[PDB]
Amino acid sequence: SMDLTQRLAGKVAVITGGASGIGLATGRRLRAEGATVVVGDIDPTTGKAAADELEGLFVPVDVSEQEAVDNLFDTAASTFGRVDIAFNNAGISPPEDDLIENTDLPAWQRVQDINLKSVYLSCRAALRHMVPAGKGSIINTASFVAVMGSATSQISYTASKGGVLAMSRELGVQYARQGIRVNALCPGPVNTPLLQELFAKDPERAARRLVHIPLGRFAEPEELAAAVAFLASDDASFITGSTFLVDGGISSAYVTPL
Amino acid sequence: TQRLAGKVAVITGGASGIGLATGRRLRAEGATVVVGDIDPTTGKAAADELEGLFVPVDVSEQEAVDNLFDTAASTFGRVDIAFNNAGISPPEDDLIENTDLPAWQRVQDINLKSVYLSCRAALRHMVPAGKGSIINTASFVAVMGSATSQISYTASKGGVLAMSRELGVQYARQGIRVNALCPGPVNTPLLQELFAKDPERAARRLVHIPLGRFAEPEELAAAVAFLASDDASFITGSTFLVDGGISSAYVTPL
Amino acid sequence: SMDLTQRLAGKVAVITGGASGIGLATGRRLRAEGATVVVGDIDPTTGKAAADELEGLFVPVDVSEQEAVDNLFDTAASTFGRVDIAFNNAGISPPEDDLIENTDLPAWQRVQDINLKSVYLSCRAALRHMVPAGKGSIINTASFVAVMGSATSQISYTASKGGVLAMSRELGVQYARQGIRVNALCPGPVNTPLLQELFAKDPERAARRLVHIPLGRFAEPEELAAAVAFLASDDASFITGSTFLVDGGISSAYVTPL
Amino acid sequence: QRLAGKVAVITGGASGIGLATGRRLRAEGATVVVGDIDPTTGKAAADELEGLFVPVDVSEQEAVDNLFDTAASTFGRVDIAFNNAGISPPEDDLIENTDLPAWQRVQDINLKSVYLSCRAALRHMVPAGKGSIINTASFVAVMGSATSQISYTASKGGVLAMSRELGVQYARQGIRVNALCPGPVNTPLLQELFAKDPERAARRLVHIPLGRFAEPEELAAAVAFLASDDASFITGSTFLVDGGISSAYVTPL
Numbered sequence A, C: 001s002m003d004l005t006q007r008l009a010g011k012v013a014v015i016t017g018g019a020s021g022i023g024l025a026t027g028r029r030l031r032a033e034g035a036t037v038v039v040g041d042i043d044p045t046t047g048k049a050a051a052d053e054l055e056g057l058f059v060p061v062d063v064s065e066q067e068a069v070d071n072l073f074d075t076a077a078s079t080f081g082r083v084d085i086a087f088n089n090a091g092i093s094p095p096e097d098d099l100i101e102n103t104d105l106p107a108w109q110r111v112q113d114i115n116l117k118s119v120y121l122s123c124r125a126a127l128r129h130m131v132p133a134g135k136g137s138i139i140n141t142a143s144f145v146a147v148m149g150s151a152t153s154q155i156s157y158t159a160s161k162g163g164v165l166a167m168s169r170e171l172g173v174q175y176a177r178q179g180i181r182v183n184a185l186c187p188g189p190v191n192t193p194l195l196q197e198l199f200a201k202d203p204e205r206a207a208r209r210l211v212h213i214p215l216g217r218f219a220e221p222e223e224l225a226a227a228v229a230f231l232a233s234d235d236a237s238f239i240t241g242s243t244f245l246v247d248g249g250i251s252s253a254y255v256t257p258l
Numbered sequence B: 001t002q003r004l005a006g007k008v009a010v011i012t013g014g015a016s017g018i019g020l021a022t023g024r025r026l027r028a029e030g031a032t033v034v035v036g037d038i039d040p041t042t043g044k045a046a047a048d049e050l051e052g053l054f055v056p057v058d059v060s061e062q063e064a065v066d067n068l069f070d071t072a073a074s075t076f077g078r079v080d081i082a083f084n085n086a087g088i089s090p091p092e093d094d095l096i097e098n099t100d101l102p103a104w105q106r107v108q109d110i111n112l113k114s115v116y117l118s119c120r121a122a123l124r125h126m127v128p129a130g131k132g133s134i135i136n137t138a139s140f141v142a143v144m145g146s147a148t149s150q151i152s153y154t155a156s157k158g159g160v161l162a163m164s165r166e167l168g169v170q171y172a173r174q175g176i177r178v179n180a181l182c183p184g185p186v187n188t189p190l191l192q193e194l195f196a197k198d199p200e201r202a203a204r205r206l207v208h209i210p211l212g213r214f215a216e217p218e219e220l221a222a223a224v225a226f227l228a229s230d231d232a233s234f235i236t237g238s239t240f241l242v243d244g245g246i247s248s249a250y251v252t253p254l
Numbered sequence D: 001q002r003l004a005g006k007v008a009v010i011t012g013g014a015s016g017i018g019l020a021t022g023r024r025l026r027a028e029g030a031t032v033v034v035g036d037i038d039p040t041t042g043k044a045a046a047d048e049l050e051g052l053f054v055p056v057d058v059s060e061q062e063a064v065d066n067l068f069d070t071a072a073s074t075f076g077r078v079d080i081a082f083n084n085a086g087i088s089p090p091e092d093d094l095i096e097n098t099d100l101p102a103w104q105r106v107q108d109i110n111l112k113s114v115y116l117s118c119r120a121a122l123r124h125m126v127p128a129g130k131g132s133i134i135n136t137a138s139f140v141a142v143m144g145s146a147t148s149q150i151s152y153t154a155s156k157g158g159v160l161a162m163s164r165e166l167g168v169q170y171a172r173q174g175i176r177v178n179a180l181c182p183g184p185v186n187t188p189l190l191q192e193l194f195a196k197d198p199e200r201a202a203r204r205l206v207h208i209p210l211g212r213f214a215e216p217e218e219l220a221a222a223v224a225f226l227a228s229d230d231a232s233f234i235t236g237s238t239f240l241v242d243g244g245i246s247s248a249y250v251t252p253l
């Protein structure tokens, strides 16, 4: 009776950072549930390729720029008449952003611009279309580091995601009687081919992290995709302002199982 | 369709409210539902509607909880999903000043002991299978306190939350996820009528709910289907709040 | 001009489980700040010894019994005039309560009786005195395990402390306009001479726990005593319903420092 | 005597919570360095506390470094840092009505400032092998509101997350880092305003179990606790002093 293949039928979803990682996994999952996907990404090559795969739309965007972000959402609304879903997901974690002791202001500010400012811009743009429409679901990518701190610190990254979480929560409360939901996706660490190789080459480094993850592994991007589809859908109609942790138990755990 | 195709789900308190709505939703995704309930009349009717199995149970008794899961497993071969959901909120459990020991203990027996029994029995079956999803019904009151207190109820749900979290951590490498469903207040035809005849009482609660309304049982059912499924494969030990923004809000929108 | 040796001058404090551990350390600290301490404990030998050291009063009590708990607080109020502070701290962690697979009902229920029912009884009794007096500060001992789960589980203990936390929070909210504050003390693991010897002999068992504690050690009971003195005092006048974590950073930490 | 001899740097120390905290730390024996943007009120606060005023814009790296370097060269060390400077300007409001200059200004003064202040404080505390840092976040880092100041809220969420991480990171170097999260704080201005507009007051107070805003002295008491050895097993804390706000559904009458 319940077919998930039409859960997002006819819904227009904008995804930033959509050409890779959880952004691309999410694009595939929303498309599989019937959504029309607008891929916004800084890379025109991988961006075009993603949109082609999803039978969707590519708009090039630097999410740290107000004009680019407005253009993304405005192009989406002009093309399809509406924006139903916004997955405000673009973010970076560059090597120059590290321990507070060795992280200088250019690194600090660049990460804020691309990770926190971008979410302010993206929410403002999405709301410009969603509010007069009387409906919408916004998912902002924060992180489990918005709730849990680490000795292996990337200090501007951590602050930016804390900012994303608190802003997401407030927006969710603010717009809760205007037909809109806003939620913060807080992923645990996410697996990549590069990490899989690195962890195999350095078991000590891997174990230093895995000992704090009850499930004993990083997330696959498809697992985050499943959560965004849930939040984007009417299955999450009573969920707004959420600290939506998909972290394999990290935030819940003291001593982990063997 | 068929996110839960072939899966066997045991639901306690499955004959009413969230339990019943969840039964319907899991069935719609392909699950076989075993309805465990103290009420044989509504229990049989729910199982008949879901094309499932009704099994009498008193969730406060070890023999009965063990028989519920044993019967589900012997009948269908396995228990994939346990929604340990049965609970009460009797009027004799109220403000701590007026709440006496019989009421205190009855609520602990039915709401907290029951989840220990149900998880112990579910795990007996799930651990050798190497897979399972357990959803325990706590409450948003495990996270938020209220002046309109039912004190044993609140303590029991805090206990459910903490135990759920720990079981989730403990079994995370044995293929079994454990999560605490924490609903906000749930709507009923009765509450809908009461709130209409008494807008002051309604407002006193609704002013703390951003969405401005109680949940529908179907909305909790949607969350349990998510948690029961592989869509939540990286979610365990969760304080899974489905509360319309209650735990997140200071000043609410008009 | 701030002298803490007078912060609780004349205040009457009832401490359950006052003969040992955190309870005893807290008695010393409250007394050092000028309080009159009523030591409620099941053990008359250590109970009397504590009250003698604290220049206070020992009152025998089984905190799992309504009559005994009512007698403890009624005796404190009759003997010293009032109950200003209640530190509802008595609790047990017996070995028969362990992993859920191996934990039978008598152990389950015994821990619920002594750890959770006891806090209901103790709060109900303290409030009988504090409400008419229009003032009071109640501190209930929960645990960091009310917030964080462990694979090394004592399942009834954990449930009991989750129950204590939620009840404390609700009581704190409920009585916030009646001159009373109620807060949950949530200690991390606390050190003992026994534990220090056990960890020295068994570095493996030790590191399995310490790797999740940013401070790198268990708490000393005096550190919890200092938190209770704060919560009992007017220095915590705007703190009620708190999940008051004194846990060396456990609930906050992913990867810990070396 | 709890803070006898300890040197405490307080940004925003010339008014509000910063000033109340200066008085409390002094009353426990601390030496207070008042870092503030206004020299006249700054010197006034320092003179009262028998401390030292250092002029500083906490959004400037060179000025923040000078603040902590001057504290260390004058009194030998920095034992306590209360990184408390922040603003809540009206230009920062609902997200629909908040432009980029307003957004960025609040991030600069509220969040960047805490990164700069922590970097400088830690640089001094690490050699000493001891120190206690208290960063002022807010209860809005934990609870959202429809009456939104969106950059402020974001900045304070950032302050909380960064405080938590630093507290974890430095926990085995004898340093503690904690986030003070105050509820709404009373002022004479607010007090008169809530009298003239009781409907406005009621809209907020119905979410506060204690039924009032905090007095700055109450926050000062919490900072003194965190600054002291009484909080030696507390680090990385979301230290809520919010009258029960983050804990409450239906509030008492």
Ligand SMILES: NC(=O)c1ccc[n+]([C@@H]2O[C@H](COP(=O)([O-])OP(=O)(O)OC[C@H]3O[C@@H](n4cnc5c(N)ncnc54)[C@H](O)[C@@H]3O)[C@@H](O)[C@H]2O)c1
Pocket: A016, A017, A018, A019, A020, A021, A022, A023, A040, A041, A042, A043, A061, A062, A063, A064, A089, A090, A091, A092, A093, A114, A141, A142, A143, A144, A186, A187, A188, A189, A190, A191
């Ligand atoms: N361990 C993790 O990967 C992890 C964990 C938790 C949260 N997150 C967050 O999830 C989001 C994506 O994670 P991911 O693993 O998929 O990373 P990813 O590198 O695989 O994807 C990031 C995408 O964003 C694009 N992008 C980068 N800068 C951009 C800019 N200015 N404008 C527009 N697009 C830009 C990139 O081209 C890239 O396609 C990030 O916000 C990340 O911080 C990641």
Ligand SMILES: NC(=O)c1ccc[n+]([C@@H]2O[C@H](COP(=O)([O-])OP(=O)(O)OC[C@H]3O[C@@H](n4cnc5c(N)ncnc54)[C@H](O)[C@@H]3O)[C@@H](O)[C@H]2O)c1
Pocket: B012, B013, B014, B015, B016, B017, B018, B019, B036, B037, B038, B039, B042, B057, B058, B059, B060, B085, B086, B087, B088, B089, B110, B137, B138, B139, B140, B182, B183, B184, B185, B186, B187
């Ligand atoms: N506002 C809410 O309804 C709300 C909010 C949060 C959490 N919860 C919790 O959700 C769960 C379900 O709530 P609901 O409103 O749907 O309840 P409900 O009263 O509508 O139906 C629950 C079922 O539990 C059955 N039951 C009662 N005692 C039993 C026992 N000893 N053994 C076996 N079955 C028994 C009842 O016969 C009934 O069919 C409960 O645990 C509740 O505490 C409810």
Ligand SMILES: NC(=O)c1ccc[n+]([C@@H]2O[C@H](COP(=O)([O-])OP(=O)(O)OC[C@H]3O[C@@H](n4cnc5c(N)ncnc54)[C@H](O)[C@@H]3O)[C@@H](O)[C@H]2O)c1
Pocket: C016, C017, C018, C019, C020, C021, C022, C023, C040, C041, C042, C043, C061, C062, C063, C064, C089, C090, C091, C092, C093, C114, C141, C142, C143, C144, C186, C187, C188, C189, C190, C191
């Ligand atoms: N690692 C830890 O020690 C730790 C951590 C977090 C929370 N806690 C909790 O802190 C509280 C105190 O812990 P502790 O380590 O200081 O205990 P303790 O064993 O060192 O002291 C025991 C005291 O409690 C008394 N007691 C036991 N049962 C009693 C009963 N029915 N009635 C009256 N008194 C009774 C004992 O006789 C004694 O007076 C407990 O509730 C504990 O669960 C402990």
Ligand SMILES: NC(=O)c1ccc[n+]([C@@H]2O[C@H](COP(=O)([O-])OP(=O)(O)OC[C@H]3O[C@@H](n4cnc5c(N)ncnc54)[C@H](O)[C@@H]3O)[C@@H](O)[C@H]2O)c1
Pocket: D011, D012, D013, D014, D015, D016, D017, D018, D035, D036, D037, D038, D056, D057, D058, D059, D084, D085, D086, D087, D088, D109, D136, D137, D138, D139, D181, D182, D183, D184, D185, D186
């Ligand atoms: N309701 C509240 O007041 C409340 C609640 C929670 C958190 N907070 C936060 O507590 C902290 C202090 O609050 P307050 O009420 O005492 O504010 P306040 O306005 O009374 O004091 C702020 C001080 O900081 C100074 N200052 C401003 N900008 C500066 C700059 N660039 N560089 C150096 N100094 C500067 C000011 O001169 C002033 O003395 C702030 O961070 C605030 O956001 C306030």
Ligand SMILES: [Mg+2]
Pocket: A092, A093, A094, A095
């Ligand atoms: Mg990176």
Ligand SMILES: [Mg+2]
Pocket: B088, B089, B090, B091
């Ligand atoms: Mg009821």
Ligand SMILES: [Mg+2]
Pocket: C092, C093, C094, C095
């Ligand atoms: Mg023990």
Ligand SMILES: [Mg+2]
Pocket: D087, D088, D089, D090
């Ligand atoms: Mg302002």
Ligand SMILES: [Zn+2]
Pocket: A211, A212, A253, A254, C211, C212, C253, C254
């Ligand atoms: Zn850990």
Ligand SMILES: [Zn+2]
Pocket: B207, B208, B249, B250, D206, D207, D248, D249
């Ligand atoms: Zn509220």
